[PDB]
Design a protein around this ligand. Sequence first.
Ligand SMILES: [Mg+2]
Ligand SMILES: [Mg+2]
Ligand SMILES: [Mg+2]
Ligand SMILES: [Mg+2]
Ligand SMILES: [Mg+2]
Ligand SMILES: [Mg+2]
Ligand SMILES: [Mg+2]
Ligand SMILES: [Mg+2]
Ligand SMILES: [Mg+2]
Ligand SMILES: [Mg+2]
Ligand SMILES: [Mg+2]
Ligand SMILES: [Mg+2]
Ligand SMILES: [Mg+2]
Ligand SMILES: [Mg+2]
Ligand SMILES: [Mg+2]
Ligand SMILES: [Mg+2]
Ligand SMILES: [Mg+2]
Ligand SMILES: [Mg+2]
Ligand SMILES: [Mg+2]
Ligand SMILES: [Mg+2]
Ligand SMILES: [Mg+2]
Ligand SMILES: [Mg+2]
Ligand SMILES: [Mg+2]
Ligand SMILES: [Mg+2]
Ligand SMILES: [Mg+2]
Ligand SMILES: [Mg+2]
Ligand SMILES: [Mg+2]
Ligand SMILES: [Mg+2]
Ligand SMILES: [Mg+2]
Ligand SMILES: [Mg+2]
Ligand SMILES: [Mg+2]
Ligand SMILES: [Mg+2]
Ligand SMILES: [Mg+2]
Ligand SMILES: [Mg+2]
Ligand SMILES: [Mg+2]
Ligand SMILES: [Mg+2]
Ligand SMILES: [Mg+2]
Ligand SMILES: [Mg+2]
Ligand SMILES: [Mg+2]
Ligand SMILES: [Mg+2]
Ligand SMILES: [Mg+2]
Ligand SMILES: [Mg+2]
Ligand SMILES: [Mg+2]
Ligand SMILES: [Mg+2]
Ligand SMILES: [Mg+2]
Ligand SMILES: [Mg+2]
Ligand SMILES: [Mg+2]
Ligand SMILES: [Mg+2]
Ligand SMILES: [Mg+2]
Ligand SMILES: [Mg+2]
Ligand SMILES: [Mg+2]
Ligand SMILES: [Mg+2]
Ligand SMILES: [Mg+2]
Ligand SMILES: [Mg+2]
Ligand SMILES: [Mg+2]
Ligand SMILES: [Mg+2]
Ligand SMILES: [Mg+2]
Ligand SMILES: [Mg+2]
Ligand SMILES: [Mg+2]
Ligand SMILES: [Mg+2]
Ligand SMILES: [Mg+2]
Ligand SMILES: [Mg+2]
Ligand SMILES: [Mg+2]
Ligand SMILES: [Mg+2]
Ligand SMILES: [Mg+2]
Ligand SMILES: [Mg+2]
Ligand SMILES: [Mg+2]
Ligand SMILES: [Mg+2]
Ligand SMILES: [Mg+2]
Ligand SMILES: [Mg+2]
Ligand SMILES: [Mg+2]
Ligand SMILES: [Mg+2]
Ligand SMILES: [Mg+2]
Ligand SMILES: [Mg+2]
Ligand SMILES: [Mg+2]
Ligand SMILES: [Mg+2]
Ligand SMILES: [Mg+2]
Ligand SMILES: [Mg+2]
Ligand SMILES: [Mg+2]
Ligand SMILES: [Mg+2]
Ligand SMILES: [Mg+2]
Ligand SMILES: [Mg+2]
Ligand SMILES: [Mg+2]
Ligand SMILES: [Mg+2]
Ligand SMILES: [Mg+2]
Ligand SMILES: [Mg+2]
Ligand SMILES: [Mg+2]
Ligand SMILES: [Mg+2]
Ligand SMILES: [Mg+2]
Ligand SMILES: [Mg+2]
Ligand SMILES: [Mg+2]
Ligand SMILES: [Mg+2]
Ligand SMILES: [Mg+2]
Ligand SMILES: [Mg+2]
Ligand SMILES: [Mg+2]
Lengths: 88, 114, 101, 70, 271
Amino acid sequence: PITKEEKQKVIQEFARFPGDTGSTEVQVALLTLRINRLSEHLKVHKKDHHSHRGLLMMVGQRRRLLRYLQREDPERYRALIEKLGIRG
Amino acid sequence: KRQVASGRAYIHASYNNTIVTITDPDGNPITWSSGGVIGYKGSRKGTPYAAQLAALDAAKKAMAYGMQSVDVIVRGTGAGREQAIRALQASGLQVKSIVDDTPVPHNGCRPKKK
Amino acid sequence: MRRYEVNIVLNPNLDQSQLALEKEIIQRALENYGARVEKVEELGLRRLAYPIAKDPQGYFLWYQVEMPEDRVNDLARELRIRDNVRRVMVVKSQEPFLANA
Amino acid sequence: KAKVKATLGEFDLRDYRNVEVLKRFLSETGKILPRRRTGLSAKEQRILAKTIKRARILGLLPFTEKLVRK
Amino acid sequence: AVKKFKPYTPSRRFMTVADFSEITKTEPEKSLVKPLKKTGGRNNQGRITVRFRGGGHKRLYRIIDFKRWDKVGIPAKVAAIEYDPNRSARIALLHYVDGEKRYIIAPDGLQVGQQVVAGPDAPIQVGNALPLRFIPVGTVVHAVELEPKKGAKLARAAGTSAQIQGREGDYVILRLPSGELRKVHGECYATVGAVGNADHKNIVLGKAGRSRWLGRRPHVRGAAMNPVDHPHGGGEGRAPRGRPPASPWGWQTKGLKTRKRRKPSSRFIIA
RNA sequence: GUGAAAUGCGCAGAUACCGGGAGGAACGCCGAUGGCGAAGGCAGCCACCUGGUCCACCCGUGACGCUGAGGCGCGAAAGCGUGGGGAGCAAACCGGAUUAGAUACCCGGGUAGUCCACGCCCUAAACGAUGCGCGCUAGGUCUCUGGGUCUCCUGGGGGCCGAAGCU
Ligand SMILES: [Mg+2]
Ligand SMILES: [Mg+2]
Ligand SMILES: [Mg+2]
Ligand SMILES: [Mg+2]
Ligand SMILES: [Mg+2]
Ligand SMILES: [Mg+2]
Ligand SMILES: [Mg+2]
Ligand SMILES: [Mg+2]
Ligand SMILES: [Mg+2]
Ligand SMILES: [Mg+2]
Ligand SMILES: [Mg+2]
Ligand SMILES: [Mg+2]
Ligand SMILES: [Mg+2]
Ligand SMILES: [Mg+2]
Ligand SMILES: [Mg+2]
Ligand SMILES: [Mg+2]
Ligand SMILES: [Mg+2]
Ligand SMILES: [Mg+2]
Ligand SMILES: [Mg+2]
Ligand SMILES: [Mg+2]
Ligand SMILES: [Mg+2]
Ligand SMILES: [Mg+2]
Ligand SMILES: [Mg+2]
Ligand SMILES: [Mg+2]
Ligand SMILES: [Mg+2]
Ligand SMILES: [Mg+2]
Ligand SMILES: [Mg+2]
Ligand SMILES: [Mg+2]
Ligand SMILES: [Mg+2]
Ligand SMILES: [Mg+2]
Ligand SMILES: [Mg+2]
Ligand SMILES: [Mg+2]
Ligand SMILES: [Mg+2]
Ligand SMILES: [Mg+2]
Ligand SMILES: [Mg+2]
Ligand SMILES: [Mg+2]
Ligand SMILES: [Mg+2]
Ligand SMILES: [Mg+2]
Ligand SMILES: [Mg+2]
Ligand SMILES: [Mg+2]
Ligand SMILES: [Mg+2]
Ligand SMILES: [Mg+2]
Ligand SMILES: [Mg+2]
Ligand SMILES: [Mg+2]
Ligand SMILES: [Mg+2]
Ligand SMILES: [Mg+2]
Ligand SMILES: [Mg+2]
Ligand SMILES: [Mg+2]
Ligand SMILES: [Mg+2]
Ligand SMILES: [Mg+2]
Ligand SMILES: [Mg+2]
Ligand SMILES: [Mg+2]
Ligand SMILES: [Mg+2]
Ligand SMILES: [Mg+2]
Ligand SMILES: [Mg+2]
Ligand SMILES: [Mg+2]
Ligand SMILES: [Mg+2]
Ligand SMILES: [Mg+2]
Ligand SMILES: [Mg+2]
Ligand SMILES: [Mg+2]
Ligand SMILES: [Mg+2]
Ligand SMILES: [Mg+2]
Ligand SMILES: [Mg+2]
Ligand SMILES: [Mg+2]
Ligand SMILES: [Mg+2]
Ligand SMILES: [Mg+2]
Ligand SMILES: [Mg+2]
Ligand SMILES: [Mg+2]
Ligand SMILES: [Mg+2]
Ligand SMILES: [Mg+2]
Ligand SMILES: [Mg+2]
Ligand SMILES: [Mg+2]
Ligand SMILES: [Mg+2]
Ligand SMILES: [Mg+2]
Ligand SMILES: [Mg+2]
Ligand SMILES: [Mg+2]
Ligand SMILES: [Mg+2]
Ligand SMILES: [Mg+2]
Ligand SMILES: [Mg+2]
Ligand SMILES: [Mg+2]
Ligand SMILES: [Mg+2]
Ligand SMILES: [Mg+2]
Ligand SMILES: [Mg+2]
Ligand SMILES: [Mg+2]
Ligand SMILES: [Mg+2]
Ligand SMILES: [Mg+2]
Ligand SMILES: [Mg+2]
Ligand SMILES: [Mg+2]
Ligand SMILES: [Mg+2]
Ligand SMILES: [Mg+2]
Ligand SMILES: [Mg+2]
Ligand SMILES: [Mg+2]
Ligand SMILES: [Mg+2]
Ligand SMILES: [Mg+2]
Ligand SMILES: [Mg+2]
């Protein structure tokens, strides 16, 4: 599992205010991180299907949060995507 | 192999025959017997009475080699296991200690169609 | 870093000098893979159930160490390379479980 | 008869080395003794089983004791 | 694994070539006194003594170091892996720190930059060669001396490899690529691991033409000859073997062992 | 070996016993009325990588929710392709027996397969024969797993008996 400090590094960063341990942006980045660890894990454990399902669910969850943030504020969205180099 | 007073007997209880191999305390056999050796053929080799005569006969043969003391070892389940044993101690042979060593896998080879 | 109890079973019947040589190996190996040692219990010779390596007895060494988990596997491989090393079993250390208090 | 749990004093059951403790659980023939006679509960019975297996592998405990005198 | 082709021509439709992905950018062999020459379709009399050969494609010969005990302790850096038209395997040019350079059958798993060395002291792992008595039983290995100081000659083909089976006297039992078992001597060096380019057994030559580039001439069935040229030469309408299948010289070719009985070498093998 | 037998094996020394060695497959007791997973399914032990889930604290976002044609991924066994592996078992196959016959049930042999890698196949009594989500309507008992000073209280699962009600 990712290092707990590394998690903070992300939260402390994206949190649009101190103690924002649950913002939209925060969840998104917090997912993007966990998603890419899977991306690589599966990049080597191709036989590992059950985990891949997990990844689909994460990628899915990340979708709603953006779908929402996109509809909510297309300004913060544009920056968050561009920041996370996301959406290809 | 040729001359020793102490030793060991091996019961083998099939379901279609019963054999017994008396050996020296090392492992090397002195003599043996079975339902077939006794006289029976097929099902009767499985009979407990046959098993009785097997142990008896195997005993007599060992008696000659000077056998007097034997630790019994049994493998199988055939109707004759205890009857071989009972027939052993009752053979005036010294049954130091009966033991059970019947093999059984911790799940390995697939059995027959049964 | 993660805590591990690293069990080793060695050839019982062998002089204390080569037995020291075998420990020469284990000590190195650990350091070679960033194993910061902790308390160790060299229980030495012991009577064990099934006769491993044709021997009814064997010399025991129970270490304990924090180290990079990502290398505990390679270490165990390195440890087992030895012939006089009859058995290795590294384990994750855990909080003891009080039973029948 | 006598529950194996109470038969012993305070003890750790993740310890795969106090053979004297473990040995008491391990049947007359090395078979991991049934829970319905070790007096153990679900969770403890499990942790025990796992540690026994560990020991057997280290050679400390047996895999099979022959049934003596029958 | 293997490069394939779209069927823009027939034969091209099945033809497959090996991906020389591994071969580290190095077309020119190590000219440095490393290549020689070859050629020669038949024996020292003018006669052909091996049917259906000659055609190849002009190859310098890479000089391989099959002994390797001549530089004990001296380590070396694998400079590269090259193509060698003289063998099923790939070669690895390694620069000894000694300053000297050499070729060696590139074992599966070897890669550039890696260090490597020969001797009894050497650490057991791919590329390192050392006397069998020092190789931990069970380890796979290749390029095996048959007798000490005589040179490697077992398991040099692509993807081949022998494995240790146990010690016994000065000799060490091991299973050959053929599956055969035999004792080889203790002082026989042998480099650790299996041989490279294993997917070699998969190339589909694809067309008669390619076989020619390899120097293989068309081989003609004895059934398609006359009684004069071959036993099977009944010819008389796609006819069956006159029985029982024989060589051009008349020895039975289905079963029928040829290896000499009383060869003293027999004493050292097991099935 | 079976109902009894026969084929089969064995004086070229089998069976039974002991020692050394090779190799594959599967994990006894724990083990269950048990646990996990979306399903298919998952059982020796160790380490690493990883998914889902549950409890506490009342901390963060502020309806961001539900379902979901098509799409995509997964999908027991058998089966197929390339290469490897092959102890046991075993369709096909051969023999023995039984029978009116016996292309079977029983027996002695035995191949593909069952095992691994990569890639196809995509079906099932893929069954709770019961789509997913949410809210509401007696309780008794049994168990698995969390939290709390704890003959008990409170969440999350697994069975049974049963209010009302439905059929
Ligand atoms: Mg990762
Ligand atoms: Mg697998
Ligand atoms: Mg809006
Ligand atoms: Mg693009
Ligand atoms: Mg792209
Ligand atoms: Mg009869
Ligand atoms: Mg019978
Ligand atoms: Mg059968
Ligand atoms: Mg071993
Ligand atoms: Mg039991
Ligand atoms: Mg280029
Ligand atoms: Mg060139
Ligand atoms: Mg020169
Ligand atoms: Mg020149
Ligand atoms: Mg030359
Ligand atoms: Mg010639
Ligand atoms: Mg000439
Ligand atoms: Mg010449
Ligand atoms: Mg030679
Ligand atoms: Mg070669
Ligand atoms: Mg000599
Ligand atoms: Mg081929
Ligand atoms: Mg070629
Ligand atoms: Mg041809
Ligand atoms: Mg031809
Ligand atoms: Mg001619
Ligand atoms: Mg002519
Ligand atoms: Mg002819
Ligand atoms: Mg003609
Ligand atoms: Mg003819
Ligand atoms: Mg032929
Ligand atoms: Mg000849
Ligand atoms: Mg010859
Ligand atoms: Mg008859
Ligand atoms: Mg037979
Ligand atoms: Mg005779
Ligand atoms: Mg043995
Ligand atoms: Mg044996
Ligand atoms: Mg041997
Ligand atoms: Mg084999
Ligand atoms: Mg084995
Ligand atoms: Mg294997
Ligand atoms: Mg398995
Ligand atoms: Mg069970
Ligand atoms: Mg029960
Ligand atoms: Mg169940
Ligand atoms: Mg599963
Ligand atoms: Mg699995
Ligand atoms: Mg990993
Ligand atoms: Mg987990
Ligand atoms: Mg989790
Ligand atoms: Mg509140
Ligand atoms: Mg709140
Ligand atoms: Mg709080
Ligand atoms: Mg607000
Ligand atoms: Mg608020
Ligand atoms: Mg909704
Ligand atoms: Mg929608
Ligand atoms: Mg429809
Ligand atoms: Mg759909
Ligand atoms: Mg696919
Ligand atoms: Mg399965
Ligand atoms: Mg299948
Ligand atoms: Mg199949
Ligand atoms: Mg084909
Ligand atoms: Mg195959
Ligand atoms: Mg294999
Ligand atoms: Mg094969
Ligand atoms: Mg097989
Ligand atoms: Mg069979
Ligand atoms: Mg046939
Ligand atoms: Mg016949
Ligand atoms: Mg038939
Ligand atoms: Mg009839
Ligand atoms: Mg008829
Ligand atoms: Mg038939
Ligand atoms: Mg077969
Ligand atoms: Mg077929
Ligand atoms: Mg398997
Ligand atoms: Mg494998
Ligand atoms: Mg494989
Ligand atoms: Mg396809
Ligand atoms: Mg399938
Ligand atoms: Mg369907
Ligand atoms: Mg069902
Ligand atoms: Mg339902
Ligand atoms: Mg529902
Ligand atoms: Mg109530
Ligand atoms: Mg009750
Ligand atoms: Mg509780
Ligand atoms: Mg309280
Ligand atoms: Mg469930
Ligand atoms: Mg259940
Ligand atoms: Mg309930
Ligand atoms: Mg009613």
